[model samples]
Structures are given as C-alpha cells and as structure tokens.
Target: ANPEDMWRCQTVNCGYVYDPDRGDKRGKVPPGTRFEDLPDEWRCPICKATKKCFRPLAGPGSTEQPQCEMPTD
Candidate 1:
C-alpha cells in the first residue's frame, strides 16, 4: 500500500495521525486495520472530527510538511 494513503486529522488544533500498522486504540480500531476499514461513523479520537475531516498524510520520514489531500474516485 502506498504510504501516501495514510491519514491525519485536519482539525487545526487537533493532532491525530493514523498508523495503519498500529491501529488506533482510542477508536478501538485494531492493529493492521486500514483507514478505509474504519466505520463510517468513526471520528478522531482526539478532536472528535468526522472522517471527512481527515486528509491523506505523507509516508514516514517525509520531508514535506503535512497537507490535506482529499481522496477521490
């Protein structure tokens, strides 16, 4: 899977980053769970933002600053 598919909360004051290899404990999303596997009702554990608030994140060790990349068909 492309690391670019990773996701992070876009809430300005929230700092939620998704790690597919290690699923979110707060959301009860188990390890190895892909972001796409999360339930539609899932919200940011920290900010409570809906899935729409999440944006694509660059892979690990990426030099580029984080930015929102909304998914498309």
Candidate 2:
C-alpha cells in the first residue's frame, strides 16, 4: 500500500497524490524525496516539510487546505 500511495513531482515543489476517484491528482507530500520513503515519514515531503511535519491528505471527504500559522518572534 505504501508504493501505491507514493509519488513525487519532477518539479521542485509540485508533488501530489493521484486520487483517480477524485477525478485527478490532488494531494501532497513534503519536500526532500529521498527521506520521504520511510513509513515514519510517509506524509512528509522532504523537499517541502521540515523533515517532520509531513501529513497526508484526508481524501475526498476533506476540503481542508494546508495553512501556515504566523510564527511569533
């Protein structure tokens, strides 16, 4: 099931999962592709996430977009 869910974009920052049921590819992994292979980091895109904040999409049921909270200095 892991490989079935893993995919990366050749572009620097444009990787998303292929959800055929949703009509098209509409999901994302963090940055850094190499380290992203591990199940522990399944959702993390090394080329995108900070090596830890990787989270997978919630499928068709979810309408949530990723958001960043302003960091407090």
Candidate 3:
C-alpha cells in the first residue's frame, strides 16, 4: 500500500497522524495494521476523538482540512 494511504486526525488541534508504518503507540496498535482494520470504537489517542475524525492524508506535509467537532465530554 502507498504510504500516503495513511490517515490523520482531521481535528486541527489534535493533528494526530495515524501512520500504519509506525502504528499507534498509545493505542497499542501494532505495525502493519491498516486504519480500516482498526476497531470502529478506536479513537485518536491525543484528543480522544472518534475514528470518523480521521481523514486520508494526501502525502507528507500535506495541508489538512480539519472538520471534526470533538465532544467536550
């Protein structure tokens, strides 16, 4: 899979990128796991945002169009 296929948190404040090559340390997600392979309830470890908050990143250093409105709770 292309590296750019990786996803990142669209929440501007969080901007937590989900790199399949690196995996998620905080979430204990192992490497080689695709974003789609993640459980539906999985969330951004930084902001605790839902999986829907993530968007497919175009490429490295690509600008993000943030859209997620994270829950205050």
Candidate 4:
C-alpha cells in the first residue's frame, strides 16, 4: 500500500517536504525520483538544509502528521 516516499525537513526554519513526484528541477532532481535515489549532494530548497536534515515522511496521503507552517513573527 506504499506509494512514493516523501521526505520532510526537520529544521525549524524550514520544514518543506521533498516530493519525488514534484521533484525540484532547480536541484537537478527529476520527477518520480525516489528518496533513496536522491543524490547525497542535494540541498534543501526551502531552507538550504542538507539531505541529512530530512526524514522519511509518512507518505503524502496521511494527514495525521504535522506539516510545516510559516513563522508567526
């Protein structure tokens, strides 16, 4: 029942999710790429974080997990 594996940035400043289906062309990542296949040199487009800063997301279908939002300040 598993679809594509998505990743979420753990950094407080940015918590953007790296969706393989909507890969970041700016980073040279094509669409439909897998998280495991992501290049080690990839950086967070949102906060400029590293791949190590991201964690495996519970898939995109789940809404139980908390999503990242802009800071109030």
lDDT of each: 0.72, 0.33, 0.74, 0.68
Listed per candidate, the RMSD to the true structure in angstroms reads: 6.3, 10.4, 4.4, 5.9
Q: Whose lDDT is higher: candidate 2's or candidate 3's?
A: 3
> Mind giving the per-residue lDDT tens digits that candidate 2 earns over 1-73?
2433433322235454533233221124234333334444233232333322222444432333333222111
Which ranges in model 2 have alpha carbons more than 4 Å from their true place? 2-12, 16-46, 51-55, 59-61, 69-73
- Ordered by TM-score, highest first, the candidates read 3, 1, 4, 2
lDDT tens digits by residue: candidate 3, 8-56: 7766577778888878889989988888898777889899888877777
Q: Compared to the true structure, candidate 1 yields what TM-score?
A: 0.71
- Going through the candidates in the order shown, the clash numbers are 0, 10, 0, 0
Candidate 1 regions exceeding 4 Å error are 59-73
In candidate 4, the residue pairs with backbone N, CA or C atoms under 3 Å apart (3 or more residues apart, or in different chains) clash, namely none
Best by TM-score: 3
RMSD of model 2 against the true structure? 10.4
Task: Pick out the ten consecutive residues of candidate 2 with the lowest summed lDDT.
Answer: 64-73
TM-score list, all predictions: 0.71, 0.22, 0.73, 0.68
Best by lDDT: 3
